[PDB]
Amino acid sequence: PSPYVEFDRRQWRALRMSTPLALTEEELVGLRGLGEQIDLLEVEEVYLPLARLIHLQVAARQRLFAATAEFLGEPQQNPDRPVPFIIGVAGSVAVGKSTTARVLQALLARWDHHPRVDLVTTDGFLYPNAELQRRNLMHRKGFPESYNRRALMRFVTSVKSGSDYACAPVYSHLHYDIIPGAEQVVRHPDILILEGLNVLQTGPTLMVSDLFDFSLYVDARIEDIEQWYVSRFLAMRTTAFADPESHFHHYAAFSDSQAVVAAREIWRTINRPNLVENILPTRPRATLVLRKDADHSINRLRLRKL
Amino acid sequence: PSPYVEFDRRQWRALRMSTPLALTEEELVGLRGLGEQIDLLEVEEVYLPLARLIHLQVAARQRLFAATAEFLGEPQQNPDRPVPFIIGVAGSVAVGKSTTARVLQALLARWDHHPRVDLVTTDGFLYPNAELQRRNLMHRKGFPESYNRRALMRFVTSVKSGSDYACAPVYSHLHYDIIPGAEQVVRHPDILILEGLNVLQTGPTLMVSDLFDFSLYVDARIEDIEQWYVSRFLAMRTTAFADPESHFHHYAAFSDSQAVVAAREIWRTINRPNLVENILPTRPRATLVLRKDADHSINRLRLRKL
Numbered sequence: 001p002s003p004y005v006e007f008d009r010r011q012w013r014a015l016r017m018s019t020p021l022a023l024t025e026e027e028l029v030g031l032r033g034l035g036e037q038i039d040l041l042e043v044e045e046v047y048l049p050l051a052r053l054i055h056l057q058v059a060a061r062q063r064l065f066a067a068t069a070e071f072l073g074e075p076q077q078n079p080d081r082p083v084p085f086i087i088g089v090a091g092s093v094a095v096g097k098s099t100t101a102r103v104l105q106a107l108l109a110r111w112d113h114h115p116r117v118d119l120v121t122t123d124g125f126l127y128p129n130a131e132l133q134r135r136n137l138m139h140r141k142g143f144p145e146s147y148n149r150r151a152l153m154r155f156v157t158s159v160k161s162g163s164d165y166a167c168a169p170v171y172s173h174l175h176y177d178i179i180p181g182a183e184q185v186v187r188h189p190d191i192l193i194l195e196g197l198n199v200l201q202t203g204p205t206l207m208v209s210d211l212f213d214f215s216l217y218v219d220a221r222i223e224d225i226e227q228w229y230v231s232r233f234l235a236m237r238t239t240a241f242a243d244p245e246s247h248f249h250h251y252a253a254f255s256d257s258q259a260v261v262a263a264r265e266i267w268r269t270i271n272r273p274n275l276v277e278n279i280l281p282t283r284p285r286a287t288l289v290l291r292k293d294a295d296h297s298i299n300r301l302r303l304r305k306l
Numbered sequence: 307p308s309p310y311v312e313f314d315r316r317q318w319r320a321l322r323m324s325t326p327l328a329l330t331e332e333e334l335v336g337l338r339g340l341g342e343q344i345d346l347l348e349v350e351e352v353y354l355p356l357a358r359l360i361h362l363q364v365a366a367r368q369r370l371f372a373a374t375a376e377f378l379g380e381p382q383q384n385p386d387r388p389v390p391f392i393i394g395v396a397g398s399v400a401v402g403k404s405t406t407a408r409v410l411q412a413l414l415a416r417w418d419h420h421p422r423v424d425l426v427t428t429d430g431f432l433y434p435n436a437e438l439q440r441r442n443l444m445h446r447k448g449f450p451e452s453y454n455r456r457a458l459m460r461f462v463t464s465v466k467s468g469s470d471y472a473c474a475p476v477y478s479h480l481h482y483d484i485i486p487g488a489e490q491v492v493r494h495p496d497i498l499i500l501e502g503l504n505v506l507q508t509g510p511t512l513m514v515s516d517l518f519d520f521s522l523y524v525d526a527r528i529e530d531i532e533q534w535y536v537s538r539f540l541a542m543r544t545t546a547f548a549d550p551e552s553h554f555h556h557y558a559a560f561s562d563s564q565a566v567v568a569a570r571e572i573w574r575t576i577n578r579p580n581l582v583e584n585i586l587p588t589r590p591r592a593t594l595v596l597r598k599d600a601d602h603s604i605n606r607l608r609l610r611k612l
């Protein structure tokens with residue numbers, strides 16, 4: 001007896017679902033536009049149905065809002081509309097959270113019940129590099145205390161409170177730092193997706209996940225994520241590290257053997273221990289856990305029983 | 307701009323709430339035999355409408371279950387029925403959690419949608435006195451570590467897994483201990499109410515409130531609860547303290563004057579610190595906070611925006 005309904009990929013594919021679910025050509029162009037590594041078969045067979053499932057929870061919450069408001073005789077202090085529906089997306093560095101989040105964002109927006117779907121990464125809530133240096137935390141970027149938790153909690157509370165205006169800072173992956181001045185404005189979307197390492201982490205009191213209506217954890221074997229991380233580092237020699245401005249420009253000239261050593265050392269000393277200590281223990285808190293094969297294909301889905 | 311909608315008693319009274327769905331006199335009879343800190347008026351004006359509000363959420367979750375099962379084409383690995391809807395009830399010792407829980411049990415059971423409503427206290431998950439002594443915890447009964455959290459978590463997981471059978475140990479207040487070999491059986495009820503000081507407490511990983519569909523915190527001024535605690539202690543001289551076998555039999559003989567001194571000392575040294583450190587910070591985690599005045603009448607309701 002488990003708290004989850006479990007499917008492997010084969011079972012999932014074989015399901016006789018009650019839809020009518022197919023992507024539009026307009027959508028296939030859009031979905032290429034947000035990467036390319038993303039397998040379109042993945043999107044059609046797994047993420048599209050997953051989106052419909054989530055859509056059922058969003059519509060249910062919107063109708064509960066209406067039934068409750070009617071029951072209360074719409075008092076003045078009740079909001080006139082449902083507050084945004086907030087989805088957490090958690091998992092290891094390099095597991096593909098950002099891709100999953102971006103795919104879900106594009107698929108969920110296609111229902112007229114909730115056409116406005118925003119995406120915020122908690123990367124924008126990291127303390128900037130100097131502030132991290134000050135705190136002896138440069139080697140722990142992505143650990144819980146490397147983020148401004150108070151600011152993160154204020155932002156999510158503002159959105160959940162039904163504010164028409166809420167503001168998040170922005171992180172540059174190119175520069176490895178917060179862009180001073182930069183802001184992302186959120187204006188009462190129907191759905192907000194909140195993607196990050198730390199979204200399902202707990203705290204002594206009200207925590208950001210107390211405000212989630214749904215959450216995903218993107219999972220994979222630790223050895224496989226290590227390989228993805230190493231490949232990403234090697235591929236970065238051409239992109240992020242190629243700029244003579246980069247603080248990591250020296251890595252561009254590392255040949256495959258030395259690059260694998262540098263990548264694995266960084267994995268072993270920062271990202272892997274952050275996963276073991278801080279991220280993995282949050283995995284059972286997710287509404288939906290998606291596990292990936294070594295080839296990046298989803299091999300298993302666990303959904304909390306309703 | 308807040309995550310909750312707030313009503314004081316006068317506004318709650320003023321509301322044009324849909325349909326009385328009023329109470330039979332034979333039900334009101336049963337309602338007397340479980341309250342005293344819940345008056346007839348409180349049932350009529352507060353608790354009954356609250357039960358309707360909660361019923362709306364239970365019904366929504368039942369229908370979401372069915373929509374979801376149908377979308378998936380009711381596969382083998384999906385349960386045939388929704389798992390139990392679990393309601394947490396938290397607050398200070400002597401705030402009236404047990405009475406609130408018993409009233410909600412009686413009211414929520416009045417719908418055909420969910421006639422089977424179980425009630426479990428976390429007192430059953432206290433370590434037995436022998437284990438508490440071993441652990442230097444005799445002065446800390448009700449504090450987070452005084453409970454076998456692992457066993458509590460296992461019980462709630464078993465219930466949310468849709469088990470046909472889940473067992474909780476039993477705590478005797480009269481004997482001030484777990485009853486050996488005693489168990490409460492819970493058999494897939496439609497709704498389980500889990501009542502306890504500690505039900506909204508946080509932890510490093512999966513916590514019991516992760517498994518809740520709705521939660522209530524019973525609130526009051528710290529000085530008002532102290533007075534209720536004192537009255538309670540004084541009353542126990544005639545009842546639980548009367549038995550020469552009681553661990554607290556020596557308190558039976560205290561005059562009113564001296565009993566007040568003892569009660570306030572116990573409040574000051576155990577229960578109040580527990581409230582300040584461990585119980586009060588969980589208050590913002592509740593879906594619904596009910597605040598009571600000095601004579602036990604609700605003066606304020608704060609409900610999470612839907």
Ligand SMILES: CNC(=O)COc1ccc(-c2ccc(C#N)cc2)c(CN2CCN(c3ccccn3)CC2)c1
Nearest residue numbers: 093123138139140141142197232233236248266270271
């Ligand atoms: C995005 N970059 C890579 O994947 C591979 O490149 C590096 C290179 C250096 C470092 C690094 C160097 C020195 C220290 C020290 N002291 C620490 C790291 C990191 C490390 N990453 C850790 C995870 N970081 C996070 C974590 C959460 C959100 C955004 N970024 C990105 C930097 C990644």
Ligand SMILES: CNC(=O)COc1ccc(-c2ccc(C#N)cc2)c(CN2CCN(c3ccccn3)CC2)c1
Nearest residue numbers: 399429444445446447448479482503539542554572576
């Ligand atoms: C069962 N008794 C009462 O409610 C009121 O009287 C007393 C008397 C003594 C004590 C007491 C005496 C000595 C130590 C030591 N060392 C500790 C307590 C307590 C203390 N209560 C704290 C809260 N306890 C809880 C807390 C949660 C669930 C069930 N019981 C009941 C005992 C309550």
